Structures are given as structure tokens and as C-alpha cells.
Amino acid sequence: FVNQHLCGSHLVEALYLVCGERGFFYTPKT
Amino acid sequence: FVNQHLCGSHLVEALYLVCGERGFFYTPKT
Amino acid sequence: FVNQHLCGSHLVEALYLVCGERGFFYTPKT
Amino acid sequence: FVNQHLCGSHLVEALYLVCGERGFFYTPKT
Amino acid sequence: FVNQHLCGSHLVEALYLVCGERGFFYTPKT
Amino acid sequence: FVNQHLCGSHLVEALYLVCGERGFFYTPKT
Amino acid sequence: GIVEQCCTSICSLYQLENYCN
Amino acid sequence: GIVEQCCTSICSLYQLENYCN
Amino acid sequence: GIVEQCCTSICSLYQLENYCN
Amino acid sequence: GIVEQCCTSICSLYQLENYCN
Amino acid sequence: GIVEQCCTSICSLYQLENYCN
Amino acid sequence: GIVEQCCTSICSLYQLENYCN
Numbered sequence: 458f459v460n461q462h463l464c465g466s467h468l469v470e471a472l473y474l475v476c477g478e479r480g481f482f483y484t485p486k487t
Numbered sequence: 488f489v490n491q492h493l494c495g496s497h498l499v500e501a502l503y504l505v506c507g508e509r510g511f512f513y514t515p516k517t
Numbered sequence: 518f519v520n521q522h523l524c525g526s527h528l529v530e531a532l533y534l535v536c537g538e539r540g541f542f543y544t545p546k547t
Numbered sequence: 548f549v550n551q552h553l554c555g556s557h558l559v560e561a562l563y564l565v566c567g568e569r570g571f572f573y574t575p576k577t
Numbered sequence: 578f579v580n581q582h583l584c585g586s587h588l589v590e591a592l593y594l595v596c597g598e599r600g601f602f603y604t605p606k607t
Numbered sequence: 608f609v610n611q612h613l614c615g616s617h618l619v620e621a622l623y624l625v626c627g628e629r630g631f632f633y634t635p636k637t
Numbered sequence: 638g639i640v641e642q643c644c645t646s647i648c649s650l651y652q653l654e655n656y657c658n
Numbered sequence: 659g660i661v662e663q664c665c666t667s668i669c670s671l672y673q674l675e676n677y678c679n
Numbered sequence: 680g681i682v683e684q685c686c687t688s689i690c691s692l693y694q695l696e697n698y699c700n
Numbered sequence: 701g702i703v704e705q706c707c708t709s710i711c712s713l714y715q716l717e718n719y720c721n
Numbered sequence: 722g723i724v725e726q727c728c729t730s731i732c733s734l735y736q737l738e739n740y741c742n
Numbered sequence: 743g744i745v746e747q748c749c750t751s752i753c754s755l756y757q758l759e760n761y762c763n
């Protein structure tokens with residue numbers, strides 16, 4: 458795998474693909 | 488607004504949309 | 518709901534989620 | 548180019564792609 | 578068709594829509 | 608990580624994710 | 638869960654907010 | 659409409675342009 | 680307009696709703 | 701191919717890397 | 722190349738078509 | 743945090759994996 462530059466909803470997509478059935482939590486600052 | 492099927496990455500994109508800075512959890516196992 | 522920062526196709530996604538069966542119109546300047 | 552099924556958000560993303568600055572309407576009720 | 582400004586995964590989406598069953602190759606610099 | 612169904616544009620978005628700068632081919636005919 | 642509420646069934650944007658932190 | 663043309667059936671990018679303003 | 684506003688500043692879902700048919 | 705491996709069937713992110721250049 | 726061109730300037734669908742298999 | 747790091751610098755899938763449930 459390569460390093461990622463992911464902003465906005467692209468990060469959530471990436472989390473989705475990485476975590477699958479486990480799901481994930483999305484926790485921005487502030 | 489509307490009610491629709493939101494599945495998979497679209498579901499988590501909608502969560503991103505709705506929650507944004509609040510952040511969110513996506514927990515398909517429930 | 519939280520405020521949105523939506524560019525390009527992300528705005529069209531947002532319109533899609535907001536409008537559902539009603540659909541929507543996408544009208545950029547120029 | 549090609550003919551494919553374009554549904555839901557993918558349909559409106561394709562409209563965005565094709566139309567761009569012209570803008571477009573997405574009117575599923577027709 | 579209109580000209581495109583496509584970065585990151587948006588370009589891959591565009592390639593996907595343009596190429597359909599033919600598929601495509603995605604070849605960034607470096 | 609996980610195993611899931613990745614289809615269509617989601618498949619090529621995942622390829623983008625995984626491959627990035629390496630680039631990739633998407634060749635559905637095989 | 639969310640998948641049952643929003644994918645299997647249909648949900649509103651307000652129901653989606655149920656899953657915000 | 660577009661959904662019938664492009665989702666239910668298949669459409670080209672040129673048919674999609676039918677829906678541009 | 681809304682396309683520019685959402686991108687160069689911010690916009691609300693409620694503002695977006697105005698563009699539904 | 702990839703569609704059979706990852707769409708029809710399921711694949712891992714590591715199998716996806718099979719399709720990197 | 723095309724990846725950079727589309728992102729740092731603009732590109733056409735027709736230019737993109739050149740990258741289909 | 744990860745949301746900012748991925749966007750203002752880079753992040754790995756492995757770092758992302760830490761945020762799965």
C-alpha cells in the first residue's frame with residue numbers, strides 16, 4: 458500500500474474500504 | 488428532505504454529510 | 518445538520534442526498 | 548466511449564461529468 | 578462534453594465512466 | 608483489513624486507494 | 638443498526654444524524 | 659426519463675448530455 | 680450562486696434543499 | 701479478472717494490489 | 722501526463738478516452 | 743488527528759485501520 462492524501466469525504470471512503478464490516482469512527486477535530 | 492436507501496460507501500458518505508465535524512460512527516454489526 | 522464545504526461533484530452528491538426522488542438542478546455560474 | 552448503467556448518485560456524478568458548467572437537471576419522476 | 582478539472586480519485590471516476598467495459602489504465606507521474 | 612465486494616466505480620476507487628502513484632489497470636474483460 | 642435502518646430499509650437525513658457523535 | 663434511460667436501461671455519455679442545461 | 684457558495688464558503692443542507700425540483 | 705475476484709466474489713485490499721502497476 | 726494535466730489544468734473526456742484499454 | 747493528518751499531510755492505510763471498530 459501507498460500513503461494517502463485524503464480530505465473530506467475521501468477519508469471516509471478510505472475508512473469504509475479499510476474497515477469493512479468492522480465499521481469505523483470518524484472523529485475530526487473541533 | 489427525503490428518505491432513501493443508503494448503502495455501503497454511500498451510507499458513510501451520507502453520514503459524513505449529515506454529521507461532518509461532529510463526526511460519526513459507522514457500526515454495521517450494530 | 519452541519520454546514521457544508523462542497524466543491525465539484527461533492528456538491529452534486531449532496532444535492533442528490535438532499536433531494537432524493539424530487540431530483541434537483543445543478544446550475545453553476547458561467 | 549461506452550454505454551453502461553448509471554444509477555443513483557453515480558448517475559448524477561456522470562451528469563456532472565458530462566454537463567459541468569452547463570449545469571443539468573436530475574428529474575427522476577421524469 | 579465540457580472540459581474537466583479532475584484530481585485524485587475524481588479522475589479515476591471519470592476514466593471509469595469514459596471507458597466502461599474496456600477499462601483503463603491509471604498512470605500518474607512518479 | 609477486510610474482504611468485501613467492490614464493484615464498478617467503487618472497485619476503481621479502491622484500486623486508486625491501494626495503488627495510488629504506482630498506478631493501476633482496470634481490465635474488466637480480464 | 639444503521640445498515641438495517643438506512644440501507645435495507647430507508648432512512649431520512651434526520652435518522653442518519655442518529656449516528657453522529 | 660433519465661433513470662429509465664440510464665439506470666434501468668443503459669445510456670451513452672452523449673445521451674447523458676440530453677439532461678444538460 | 681449555490682455551486683460557488685458551497686465551494687468558496689459553506690452552505691447548509693437547507694440552502695441545498697432549495698435546488699430540489 | 702478483477703471483477704470476478706473483487707466484485708462477483710470478495711477480495712482483500714492485498715488482492716487489489718494485484719492490479720497495481 | 723493525463724493525471725497531472727487534468728488536475729493542474731483541465732482535460733477533455735476525449736483526452737481521457739485515450740487511456741481506455 | 744487522523745482526519746487532519748490525512749488531509750494536511752499524508753496517512754497510511756495502516757494508520758486508518760486504527761479507526762476501525
Ligand SMILES: [Cl-]
Pocket residue numbers: none
Ligand atoms: Cl476534492
Ligand SMILES: [Cl-]
Pocket residue numbers: none
Ligand atoms: Cl452502488
Ligand SMILES: [Zn+2]
Pocket residue numbers: 497557617
Ligand atoms: Zn455506488
Ligand SMILES: [Zn+2]
Pocket residue numbers: 467527587
Ligand atoms: Zn473530491
